[model samples]
Target: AEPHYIDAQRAIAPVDAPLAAPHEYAAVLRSDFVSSYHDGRDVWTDEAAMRPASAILHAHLGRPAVVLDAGAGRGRDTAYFLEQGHRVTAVDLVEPPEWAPLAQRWGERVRFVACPVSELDGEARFDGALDNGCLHHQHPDAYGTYLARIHALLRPDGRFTISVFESDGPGRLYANHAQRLYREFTEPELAELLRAAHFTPVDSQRVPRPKAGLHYLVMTARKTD
Candidate 1:
């Protein structure tokens, strides 16, 4: 049986594990759903995405900071940001009903926005942004558009921490496994992408995935004057 999904784009779910089995993760997405809002088992609930994110965000703490929780899932990292003393605008295609109660319980420190990441344009900017493990599935052609939007959303001296699956062995440019398309990138390649998008790469690190025999490159990007 297929697992239940909260919305058309498989963004958030309740599961036995934070990452609800890779194949089951893909099964939750609508067949033709095309957006940066696709699923990975760990998206909504995984702390892996936030482990390094905390240290990255720590430097920005001690101020009345505002963060763009881009690709925020189920508010796990959203609450993390708020916990760090920053106001967060959590963006996703839709908020699962499971989150409604918690959402109502929140103060103005966290705001949830329903929309696609790329299409979101606003007059307000952010001091920093957080994007976890979501961009790998984004089509290469669309990366520039998405990154530019991120660049634009930040104020000068603002920073963004982003992560995606990194290529360890094979350069699986466009491999479809389970149900969604996946891409693997090298650190240099990812760094180049950030440069082309008008961001200054501050630093990046690669960490091993639990047991997947793969790693993800986490990068800290900044908007230069």
Candidate 2:
């Protein structure tokens, strides 16, 4: 039986990952979907597509601090951080093709972990992290786990900047076994979620992705006591 879906896209095959949680399907489908980027998909997939919030996080950190590139798709923001002189541990379900050149250029300054961000562990603590385009694609039930894991990974006073589709944007909710689930968020919704996760929302802004007919809310939060 086909898993449930809402407002399905026409002529587009949903990502296939039966019985997996939304995050799992997200991980599995990331590469498949990004491939469509070249075939004229409107979703942002390159370094230039990075939102302004990245520069904000970079400024806030103010040093070459250890960074976590959560869902470091295409190594766009990861490469940016590395170029800014930070050591980055990038976590994604798979190594993007873009990472090969990045590794060659950055050498030991970058590390790629092939797994879901929620499963991330070890003694490493980062000074900051970036989720450029991950959170909005997850299921609601996974929010607690997702946010908490990120919170735990940061050092006290660490910074986390995330980008999600604005609730009012073309970003819409949909789900099924064949396709990854997506949940757009409002600024208030994101603030409360961050609050519950013990992160303090400090600043946010909306950036237009005209090609996707979407407005992404890029927010920076502080891990607070």
Candidate 3:
């Protein structure tokens, strides 16, 4: 029999395999899981979903602005921004790969910080923020806290662009993996959460999901006083 071939583009695999438990997800991050994920992917040029995000960032924040890639997984988006001449700060709970090499290559143009979102603070503020599938992994209590922290990180009128798993239809089927800690967001609930976090919705659209009949809620919002 011919080997079953899966379409790489269409296959929906979790970036990380199921953890033994919810807390184990964090433990894996503190271990080797972070490096393994980044090592597997092309740090640049492979993120198709990010093109619109990059364009939106440029439109809202202007060129040559400081951008924060919150929960930046493998520094893929960070590398893309550096190639485009935007100053980027990539933050994740795990240490990104080849940090020294990237620093040597980009030379103060990009910086990667390993810290939980809750612990981060600075007088320096970002003109724009990007969250690519990171926000959806948090438990609801932590999700609320995460949004509040994001609000504090942005400058007034700053724009935040994020992609989240919509909790409607079959998407909810994938909600709890071996990792029981992850949470999904219903469309209306997410909108309400964002509003409570002090963001004004600017634009939102659903990304197509043909296989699972799931959709990603791609949203861009601005901080309001």
Candidate 4:
């Protein structure tokens, strides 16, 4: 089926699937990412601007700005930002051997934090943040707290760039072969979540991931009181 937009304001029932509890959903997602990285299934591009969302965030950043690459798998885009002369803190749930190259090449320019995004805490603030493929794997129940945490981690007026699976009807969750839940979002649904987290919506673009027959919604929002 051709991809089409879903109205975020309308209510739609979830497709029939075994409903996993929020905690189970979280655990499965972590395991899936870890396995994908090890098996070479989930990989990233080293080419600059390969990820349009990251490019958008980079464009909004000042030279030598502090940036956060949330859920930064293998530090691909993290390296991109580092090469652009931005100081980056790359956070991921798993510590992949892939990070060694980044650490060796960009010593002190990049910091690695291995932990869930929820437990990330410190006095650090960023000029902008990127969630390239993280938000879509999150359970609906965790959306508010997760985004609020991102909001707190950024400086005022900080830009938050997020790329997520776009849904054709409401927000829907599907279970993958790894038993991980992937929630696709309608544009309006995501914009509402960002607003509730105290962010002002700026730009949103839908880009196709042709291989998977899925589209990603890339949005940039700014922190506001």
Candidate 5:
């Protein structure tokens, strides 16, 4: 009868039916986005979950600072940060129309852009970045690219949070026509990637799943000279 949302982000992210982007990227994931919102559901203008990463972001940068909501789906996380009185640049390759209302609500405090997380080329620096859970769908080779790009988008000592499926989960190489390649990682494996990017020492913990599936790990990292 109704579509179950992946979060307020994805289930909450998909908006318009057709996209206006070019072939390479659009052809691959556009329809996936369509089906996400295909139910013609009335997506609410509500704040998403108050993730652990939210507190860490505020503690690291405080208010009045600019934050990058990387992989920002439908303004869920973006709305959260905006409500917190922080300016936010919410970026996602698939820019859903649901964000327009959010932009209207937050005004200059919130901005949504259509760009791949690994390709956000800009001088618009941020005090912190929120990766959410989009990393698991990335190519291993693109890890370095994401860190480099996001690192440059931040002020010195800027911080970031990353969440992903722990390696203990169901690891598969199949794509569901709704998402990109899905991968998983162990505690050390995820930390090593952060270290390789020269991020300051990371703090990570495996969050308890309300269900008996998909172990998840959340990490907070900072950039350093």
Candidate 6:
């Protein structure tokens, strides 16, 4: 049977308040969905089930470079980069208390910035940026803006490693709601979007998925002049 659309009446409850900011919505979603995965370990660390794309990214960029983990949740990837001897800045809307120890340990080697990616502004450009399973969450209308911001953040010849949920498969799952909203995409379509944003696609691959039987599209692209 086809999955049913969530009932509009039930979906309109307080938990689905439209006036709430994006951060609030994210928080609610995290509390209900993300917290349950892996006995409360950050979902990004499930290496056995999924490989960290950063591994490839680190290899390409080499070391002694500045890296940005945009939408870095709980700093798992950020921590990995710091351990690899790269300077990393992890940015997210909220910083979990558990990350405080790592923040202190890394000290100046790693820093966490608490802000929306769209609001990010600075003159410092990074050699690479990681965005695993993040870009798909933004409303389609705002994708161009995100691309512009990322372009500004990267240095010349900088590369971006990104993962997006494909339109195919079981779709997106969340905590606050029983159903998920899957953002669909095809290779040519995504390439067009990237081209529009001044990025040239270098590679693309499909990642494994468990029960959802879905595939994640990972793209590595270089910033164009």
Q: Whose lDDT is greatest here?
A: 4
10 residues in a row with least lDDT, candidate 5: 41-50
Candidate 5 lDDT, tens digit per residue, 20-118?
233343455545554554554313223222265566666666666789988777767787788888989998767677888997898888877887876
Give lDDT per model, in order.
0.64, 0.73, 0.64, 0.78, 0.65, 0.66
Instruction: Name the lDDT of candidate 3.
Output: 0.64
Give lDDT tens digits, candidate 4, residues 1-225. Answer: 222322221122343666678887778778878887787666343322237888888877756688999999888789889989999999999888978999999999889999988888953388889998787677768888888888889987689999887887787666555665567889998898888888888889888765445578888999765
Better of 1 and 4 by TM-score: 4
Please report the TM-score between candidate 5 and the true structure: 0.75
lDDT of 3 by residue, 1-225 (tens): 111111132223333434345355556434433543555632222445445555655666666778888887767667767887888888887775556677888988897788977778873388789887777766444667788888888877678988776654333312222223333466676677788888877887776544444555778888756
> What TM-score would every model get versus the actual structure?
0.75, 0.80, 0.74, 0.86, 0.75, 0.76
lDDT of 2 by residue, 114-154 (tens): 78888898533999989887776666678888888888888
Q: Once superposed on the true structure, which residue ranges of model 3 sit more than 4 Å away at CA?
A: 1-47, 169-177, 180-182, 209-214
Report clashes for each candidate as comma-separated counts: 0, 3, 0, 0, 0, 1
- Select the stronger candidate by lDDT from 2 and 3: 2
CA shift at 192, candidate 3, in angstroms?
1.1
lDDT-sorted candidate list, best first: 4, 2, 6, 5, 3, 1
TM-score of model 2 vs. true structure: 0.80
* TM-score-sorted candidate list, best first: 4, 2, 6, 5, 1, 3
Model 6 agreement with the true structure over 1-225: per-residue lDDT tens digits: 133222211121112323335445445544433443424544444533235577867877877689999878767778888888888888876566646988788888887887768878874379999987667656455679888888889988798888775544434332224322224466666777788999998887777555345566777889765
Model 1's number of clashes is 0
The TM-score obtained by model 6 is 0.76
Q: What lDDT tens digits, residue by residue, belong to model 1 across residues 1-225? A: 123232223322222223334445344332323332244444325535346764665464447588887766677777767777788888865454435654676677777776768768874488888887667656556678788888888888788888776765544444332344455678888888888888878888886655344466888887755
